[PDB]
Amino acid sequence: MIQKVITVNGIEQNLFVDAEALLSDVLRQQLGLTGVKVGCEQGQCGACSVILDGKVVRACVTKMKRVADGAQITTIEGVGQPENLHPLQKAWVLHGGAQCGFCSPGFIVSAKGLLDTNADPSREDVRDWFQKHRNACRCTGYKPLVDAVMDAAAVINGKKPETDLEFKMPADGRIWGSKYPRPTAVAKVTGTLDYGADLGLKMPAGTLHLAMVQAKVSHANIKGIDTSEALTMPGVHSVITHKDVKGKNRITGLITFPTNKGDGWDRPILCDEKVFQYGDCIALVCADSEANARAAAEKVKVDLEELPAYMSGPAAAAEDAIEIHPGTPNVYFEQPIVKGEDTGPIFASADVTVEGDFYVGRQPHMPIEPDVAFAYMGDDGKCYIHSKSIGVHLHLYMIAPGVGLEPDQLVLVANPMGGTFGYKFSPTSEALVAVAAMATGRPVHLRYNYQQQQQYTGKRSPWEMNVKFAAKKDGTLLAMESDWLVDHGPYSEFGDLLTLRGAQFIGAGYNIPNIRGLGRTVATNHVWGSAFRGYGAPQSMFASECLMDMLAEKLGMDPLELRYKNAYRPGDTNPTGQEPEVFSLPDMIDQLRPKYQAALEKAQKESTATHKKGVGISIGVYGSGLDGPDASEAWAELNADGTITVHTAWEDHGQGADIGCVGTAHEALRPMGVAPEKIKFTWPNTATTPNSGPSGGSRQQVMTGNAIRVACENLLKACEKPGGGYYTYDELKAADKPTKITGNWTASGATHCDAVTGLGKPFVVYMYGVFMAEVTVDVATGQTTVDGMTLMADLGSLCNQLATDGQIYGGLAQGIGLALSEDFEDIKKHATLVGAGFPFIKQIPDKLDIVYVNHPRPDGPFGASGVGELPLTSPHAAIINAIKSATGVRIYRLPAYPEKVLEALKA
Amino acid sequence: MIQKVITVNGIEQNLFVDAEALLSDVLRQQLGLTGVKVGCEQGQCGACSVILDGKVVRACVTKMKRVADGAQITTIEGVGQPENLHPLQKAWVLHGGAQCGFCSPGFIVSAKGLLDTNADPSREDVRDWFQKHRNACRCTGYKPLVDAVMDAAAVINGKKPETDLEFKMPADGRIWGSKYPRPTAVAKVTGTLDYGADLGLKMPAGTLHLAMVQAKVSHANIKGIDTSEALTMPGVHSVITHKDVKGKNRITGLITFPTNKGDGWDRPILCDEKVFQYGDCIALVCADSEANARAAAEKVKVDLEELPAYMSGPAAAAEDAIEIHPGTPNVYFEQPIVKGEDTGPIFASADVTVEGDFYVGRQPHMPIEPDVAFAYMGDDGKCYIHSKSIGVHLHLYMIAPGVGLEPDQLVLVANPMGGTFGYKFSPTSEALVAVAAMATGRPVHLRYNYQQQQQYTGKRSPWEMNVKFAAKKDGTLLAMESDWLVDHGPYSEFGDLLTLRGAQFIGAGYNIPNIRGLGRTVATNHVWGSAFRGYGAPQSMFASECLMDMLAEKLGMDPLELRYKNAYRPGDTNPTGQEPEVFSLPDMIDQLRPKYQAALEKAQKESTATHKKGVGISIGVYGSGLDGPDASEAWAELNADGTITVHTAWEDHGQGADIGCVGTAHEALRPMGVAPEKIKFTWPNTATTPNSGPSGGSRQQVMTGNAIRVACENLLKACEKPGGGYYTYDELKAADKPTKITGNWTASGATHCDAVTGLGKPFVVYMYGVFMAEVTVDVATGQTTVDGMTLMADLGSLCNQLATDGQIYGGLAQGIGLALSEDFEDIKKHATLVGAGFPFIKQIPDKLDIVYVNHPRPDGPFGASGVGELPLTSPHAAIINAIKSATGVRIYRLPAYPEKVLEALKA
Ligand code: PCD
Ligand code: PCD
Ligand SMILES: O=Cc1ccccc1
Ligand SMILES: O=Cc1ccccc1
Ligand SMILES: O=Cc1ccccc1
Ligand SMILES: O=Cc1ccccc1
Ligand code: FES
Ligand code: FES
Numbered sequence A, B: 001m002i003q004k005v006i007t008v009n010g011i012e013q014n015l016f017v018d019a020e021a022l023l024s025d026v027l028r029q030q031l032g033l034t035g036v037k038v039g040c041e042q043g044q045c046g047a048c049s050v051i052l053d054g055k056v057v058r059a060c061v062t063k064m065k066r067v068a069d070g071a072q073i074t075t076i077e078g079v080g081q082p083e084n085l086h087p088l089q090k091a092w093v094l095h096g097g098a099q100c101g102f103c104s105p106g107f108i109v110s111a112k113g114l115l116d117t118n119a120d121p122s123r124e125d126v127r128d129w130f131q132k133h134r135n136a137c138r139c140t141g142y143k144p145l146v147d148a149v150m151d152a153a154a155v156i157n158g159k160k161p162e163t164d165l166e167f168k169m170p171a172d173g174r175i176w177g178s179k180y181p182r183p184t185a186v187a188k189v190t191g192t193l194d195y196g197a198d199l200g201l202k203m204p205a206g207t208l209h210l211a212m213v214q215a216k217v218s219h220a221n222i223k224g225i226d227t228s229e230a231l232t233m234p235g236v237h238s239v240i241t242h243k244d245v246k247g248k249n250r251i252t253g254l255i256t257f258p259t260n261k262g263d264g265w266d267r268p269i270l271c272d273e274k275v276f277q278y279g280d281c282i283a284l285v286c287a288d289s290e291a292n293a294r295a296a297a298e299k300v301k302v303d304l305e306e307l308p309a310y311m312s313g314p315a316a317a318a319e320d321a322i323e324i325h326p327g328t329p330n331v332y333f334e335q336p337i338v339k340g341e342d343t344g345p346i347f348a349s350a351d352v353t354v355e356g357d358f359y360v361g362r363q364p365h366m367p368i369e370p371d372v373a374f375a376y377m378g379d380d381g382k383c384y385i386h387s388k389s390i391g392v393h394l395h396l397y398m399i400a401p402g403v404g405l406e407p408d409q410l411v412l413v414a415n416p417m418g419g420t421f422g423y424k425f426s427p428t429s430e431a432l433v434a435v436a437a438m439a440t441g442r443p444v445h446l447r448y449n450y451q452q453q454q455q456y457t458g459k460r461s462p463w464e465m466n467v468k469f470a471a472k473k474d475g476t477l478l479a480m481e482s483d484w485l486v487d488h489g490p491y492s493e494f495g496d497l498l499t500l501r502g503a504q505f506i507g508a509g510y511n512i513p514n515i516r517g518l519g520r521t522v523a524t525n526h527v528w529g530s531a532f533r534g535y536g537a538p539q540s541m542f543a544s545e546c547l548m549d550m551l552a553e554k555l556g557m558d559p560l561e562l563r564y565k566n567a568y569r570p571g572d573t574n575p576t577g578q579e580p581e582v583f584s585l586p587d588m589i590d591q592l593r594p595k596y597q598a599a600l601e602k603a604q605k606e607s608t609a610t611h612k613k614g615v616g617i618s619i620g621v622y623g624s625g626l627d628g629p630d631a632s633e634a635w636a637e638l639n640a641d642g643t644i645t646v647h648t649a650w651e652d653h654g655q656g657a658d659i660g661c662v663g664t665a666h667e668a669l670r671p672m673g674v675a676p677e678k679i680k681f682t683w684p685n686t687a688t689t690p691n692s693g694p695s696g697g698s699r700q701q702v703m704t705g706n707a708i709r710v711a712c713e714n715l716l717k718a719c720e721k722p723g724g725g726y727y728t729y730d731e732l733k734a735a736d737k738p739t740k741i742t743g744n745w746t747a748s749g750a751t752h753c754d755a756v757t758g759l760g761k762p763f764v765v766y767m768y769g770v771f772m773a774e775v776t777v778d779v780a781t782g783q784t785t786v787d788g789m790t791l792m793a794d795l796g797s798l799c800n801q802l803a804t805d806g807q808i809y810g811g812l813a814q815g816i817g818l819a820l821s822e823d824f825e826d827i828k829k830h831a832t833l834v835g836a837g838f839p840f841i842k843q844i845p846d847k848l849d850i851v852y853v854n855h856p857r858p859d860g861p862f863g864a865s866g867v868g869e870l871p872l873t874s875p876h877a878a879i880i881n882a883i884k885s886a887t888g889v890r891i892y893r894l895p896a897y898p899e900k901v902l903e904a905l906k907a
């Protein structure tokens, strides 16, 4: 051990440390500076950036031996605090740079380091700095972060006043549609919002820390578990196995379709008879620290009989493949789509037909914050779980039978969280921590490392797809045929539903009167399927939007004009036979057209012999809602202090549940003149907030926004004074009148798609957009650079533009990853950010352009649709279409790795 | 467990706590708010004061179940921080209220609570508030704290500007003699100085926490130790016993006098064959937490044979008493005093003689911070100990043979500390933590609770005394006889030396030509003797200063005039035959006289039938130095940045080592124009600071101040430019000239007192003072209230008036305790602050008056003497003399408990 006397955030510290200890652990654990965020733990994400003697360093890869006596360290807590914000922190708030906020401290500390060395950077300088310092963001697409640095720099330089970093209220007092900052931004930019790992450090001494004993093969029969060496190891309390589970030890899919061949009870909590994928949790070590639990987990011995594993859909779907879940066929679900007339004769007599085989793979969510949860037995006898769940009520019912609790005896709460992008539509750690809390009686905390986040959370499910179009010479679509095979890994939850998305979205955007197709879901031993932003559309629309360009090429038609010819107009129906609710695609195409033509001309002019430029187009469409007559609930409550609490379970991945609540409520409450800072939101809690539903399917703004609207309208009615005006809280209480008022809303016009035909009216609101990608391909290396992305977006009406702009930039950036670099195929190689192709800042162009072409929705609150998944529906199709524009080669199977492009260029 | 969402220092906290947990532990351990200081843990000291929903509460006695959802909590960290001080914090700094600083956060938070309820308090209101809220201070005597509250209130009230709370530099730029604030004040008042327990919370995960297995009888032979149940308990690493000690397992007294009958090796580190006092450490449990270590220590079983214990000096000194240390007589040392002619004939022929039997007891130091230390093995192979040692070099040599290390392989460091008042002149926990660090190889931390602080740290040693005077009718002293018996408990360290203090100080202040006396030191089974501020003078001078009043009464002379007649004047010698170095007692008496006469007249006027007022006088004298030719060393170093570091081992109990260094160096460096903020001090460290010696004997200002002066003079010489002016650092380094310069100083005129006669010249500088106490006795109850204290003080020259004023107020307050309420006699009843008679604010008058009558010392730096122990030399004699003035009764045996006074009143 050594004494080191240093200065931390301006205060001399008399530190006692191990020279080998990591600076991140010293700062977080010894000094309580949990504003130093840790994600990857491998020097790849920048979340743990600190200033050490004038240099920006990653604290997770800096050992204390590198910190000299008299060193100066700055963390986010030294940059500024809530009543004392630095210009960078104010700028982050103003520009909406904190979505989940998990990267915000590290970017802000890194940016201070930049500005202390280069006071007036160019945008390019800012991007180069964040590239060099590995500052990674999965939410924002980087552009808002660069905007904030530039604004802060201008203030620090005396070029503009610091007051201009503070939001100015619009003259009408309307925050709906404005850039009003989100309520959580200040806590995020100051490192004073505690995420799950932060909470773990601040739990009491009695808390047990868990480590998973995980399968290191993909498929096996389990013979036994020997915990004896582990029990003797330092700090070890006990080891938990399936024998300690008090219920069924299975998670239920809950809404398993009747025509699914499986019962939906296939997923274990702790493996008992079998390993179904690499990473499966077989046991939990409980210890006094994460480090001691992990060390002991390595010594737990699992005796198993390895079985042949099926590592892709086609392999598992083979007629003679062995059943992974004995008694259920590996191909456990099929969804037909049968619209209009038989397609065979139409293809036979059409002027033109095209066909393609396409593949979109096992995209990894890669939030900067790895999964984390905790649980405890309450003083009331209930089991409480605090996790990254984005569907607290959903998960309660998915896990309660398995853990052996009645629903009223379990409470799920959503912690502040550092992104999910859908993986938290699935249970991950909730049942594990519940079992351990119940077994021990003690609080328990489980933190996944980044390799566990990659290997042992769910993934986008790969689809193998064949799609065909028949058309007239003038480009009019006549018919489509489609076939898709969905590799869902071993756990069925929502896999049938995902497969149904192919019936809804392959070919969406156009009038297609005659469709015949079939989707099939297959269990495999690769990673189980969890929702990933777009949930079936990125697969579906990659196929159909690439195929539209192939059709245009075969006709000798411009691909934007081919889309214009076929795009939804009044009278048309979508693939499920439903009329669209608005018709904005022609408007968007007309507004894009001159920008597209200019981009084509630029690409021609700026191409060289070696660096070929191209432009690609695609359309995107997706529903806002869960299928059928989805619903939500909110409670609007006047508090004694005159503030209003809007109670919901709107789960915040980081997309903006807070600002969606406040902005929607503000608009609904305008007749009573309620200031936005007087409106409070509630963190999701199954005991004390209504069942607003999960934050999946780009649904909350529509469903919960409408419920908030209705609740607020009902509160206005409850407060109305006879003769005009409104009663105060005191007046209502004096009259024994209610002050907490419910509102509900249901998408009553919606119907579920039919099991035989696929037809129905599954959503009452959709999101519509048109993408343009501009790319350069180095034809010597096959490397593609995306130089610009544009999204024409119809969101109906914006609740908050900082929120929607950010959602779109983030989705576009994930689209660039999906197109060019990302996968989770190799269990070890793809288990790091860099290994799996995470997009760092230079991969994302500074030119991300949005044009709102908003057509108010009949059923949306104040006309709003959702936004969340729109920007990931098909940006990757536009990008691949741009590669084809540039070079003549079409990549059919994502991602477009350089060697793959090269092989195609040279063929 | 329960979730509680509250606001702490203005920031919303999502807390997870046990409802039974103490708020102090939650704040310190879970939230890292180590500015919430914990001392007593029993609700008696206020150090842990926090604001909870507008009320000031003691966090150590507030369980989390009392903290509601939505509560607001403020700790010192929320009051203000170093670059953002609250008016209360600025006022504390300006008024010198932070000496050790351990109480400062709690007083400041409590004071904010006061001012938030009463914006313009009277001084009386402030005192009532601190009484009610149990805010205890052992250093300051409270008056500076009240001063600071009043000043802050005036600023908060808009009555004066906040800039007036900032120190204004004197026009001459001289900080010597000024009220310049001490360097450590800001850290103290913001809770950002880490004391030993604070450091323990910030040590790494590998650190083992210790608990002592202690004797629960006063005397025994040990048969065995059974650790088997303890080893099975939660978090337990191991149990350490004498078998794990690698050296002699004894602490050496190091300077044991040759005529001591014992070898000075009597004290064990871990008891092996015997228990010698209640509390003796027999074993150490090492565990993952203090709580788990303590729980397991309760289960360690010690098999012993209890022996009859001798619980007082007279009991142990009986001719037939059994030897506590077999082979050494319990009366192990005698010191004669033989000055001038045989006293028997002089007593026989004197006009007047008086005699008394007096007792001063086992006063407990009662710092607000209980003892704490830690140790570790360095990366360099050495064992490092960080403790409350106020003699780091001394303790190294006292413990190294016992722990089994050569001196170069052990390093002792003084942590910031919350007071000692001398108990840390002894080793307490240093050898214990060293043994455990060496045995385990791991860092170890040991925190005493308050009962352990009381029972198992050393104490003022009781003296049973008989003193006699012979005098002429005109009051001229002719002769003195003296006998004293010193109860030193079982451990001999410095007990012989303490006994020699009786030869030096009984009767000090007056010319006494003929003295015959004998002191004896006796081992007992009550608590071992450690220095307590005054170290023999409070005992000695209680006897002689009470006896002077008895002589005055017998002569019918005024007691101030009797002292005036006999006080040192040129030609006189002190009891050891040495000439005083200055002669300030007549000056001080002459300046006090009219104040004394006015006080007498007030007492007569304001007395009532039931409440009798009186006035008492005493003189105090004490040396500044260790006996003989004491010495010190300092290094003055010009740093590259132009600051100057003055390297010393001046140990800071809280008295002001920091400001003594800076002020002395500033004065010495004036020719070079060095600003005070450019002068740095060093925390004591045996490896990297010179052997400046211990902070005992009121010596550091004289010894180390002179060494600092000499070092700085030598640095000036090293920097002098030919032709005038001074070279910069860069110029000196360019010329390869030295920049770190040594200075040494020795008290060359001093000699040790003779073993046969007691004569010598033990100190070259003394401190001189005259006390006046004003009291009221309720004759129905026997309760005494001290209404005022005055000290006339000759300190030569003041280094810093905030420091000296504070030292005097603190010593006067300890004198009130010693006179009226304090003891450690009952092992259990006296093991709490309240039980042992700690003086809370209402016991200490607001009227504490100092008059400096400074006579520059020939050998002091810039003429300075010490101050530390002067104010505790005889204030308790003045108080008892005042009780006699008021009521006619004399208390001979301290303390003057109400029942004791009543019995005397009614006899
Ligand atoms: N018009 C409009 C719309 C919208 N908005 C906004 O925006 C947001 C969003 O919304 P939406 O769309 O409704 O959504 P939500 O439901 O809330 O959420 C969800 C999503 O969200 C997204 N985004 C995001 N972001 C971020 N940052 N992070 C994340 O993680 C995430 N995730 C993702 C996903 S995946 Mo799934 O589960 O797969 O189906 S679905 C999803 C919010 O804040 C709101 O409010 C506005 O403003 N306006
Ligand atoms: N002239 C003069 C003198 C002095 N000063 C200051 O004052 C202080 C003190 O000093 P001195 O006297 O020199 O002393 P020191 O050595 O440093 O110290 C010690 C002491 O100190 C005291 N004080 C105090 N305070 C406080 N706060 N706390 C404490 O704990 C204490 N402790 C106590 C004791 S006890 Mo023995 O060990 O028994 O012998 S001794 C003693 C310092 O700060 C200095 O600098 C000045 O200013 N001036
Ligand atoms: O309410 C949660 C849920 C989840 C999946 C489908 C439908 C509803
Ligand atoms: O966005 C994720 C999701 C998951 C299940 C159903 C609908 C949406
Ligand atoms: O240097 C420490 C010391 C201690 C007691 C007496 C003499 C010196
Ligand atoms: O003030 C404490 C002390 C102890 C030993 C020798 C001199 C002084
Ligand atoms: S770079 Fe340190 S946590 Fe990712
Ligand atoms: S805001 Fe950057 S990772 Fe979420």
Ligand code: FES
Binding pocket: B037, B038, B039, B040, B041, B042, B043, B044, B045, B046, B047, B048, B049, B058, B059, B060, B061
């Ligand atoms: S009153 Fe709480 S530590 Fe003393």
Ligand code: FES
Binding pocket: B097, B098, B099, B100, B101, B102, B103, B104, B136, B137, B138, B139, B140, B368, B418, B419, B654
């Ligand atoms: S300053 Fe108050 S206890 Fe030391």
Ligand SMILES: [Cl-]
Binding pocket: A890, A891, A892, A893, A894
């Ligand atoms: Cl391909």
Ligand SMILES: [Cl-]
Binding pocket: A897, A898, A899, A900
């Ligand atoms: Cl490649």
Ligand SMILES: [Cl-]
Binding pocket: B890, B891, B892, B893, B894
């Ligand atoms: Cl008595």
Ligand SMILES: [Cl-]
Binding pocket: B897, B898, B899, B900
């Ligand atoms: Cl009494």
Ligand SMILES: [Mg+2]
Binding pocket: A085, A086, A087
């Ligand atoms: Mg500022």
Ligand SMILES: [Mg+2]
Binding pocket: A263, A265, A266
């Ligand atoms: Mg089944």
Ligand SMILES: [Mg+2]
Binding pocket: A511
């Ligand atoms: Mg038509």
Ligand SMILES: [Mg+2]
Binding pocket: A825
């Ligand atoms: Mg590969």
Ligand SMILES: [Mg+2]
Binding pocket: B085, B086, B087
């Ligand atoms: Mg202020």
Ligand SMILES: [Mg+2]
Binding pocket: B263, B265, B266
């Ligand atoms: Mg011996």
Ligand SMILES: [Mg+2]
Binding pocket: B511
């Ligand atoms: Mg004379």
Ligand SMILES: [Mg+2]
Binding pocket: B825
């Ligand atoms: Mg008694």
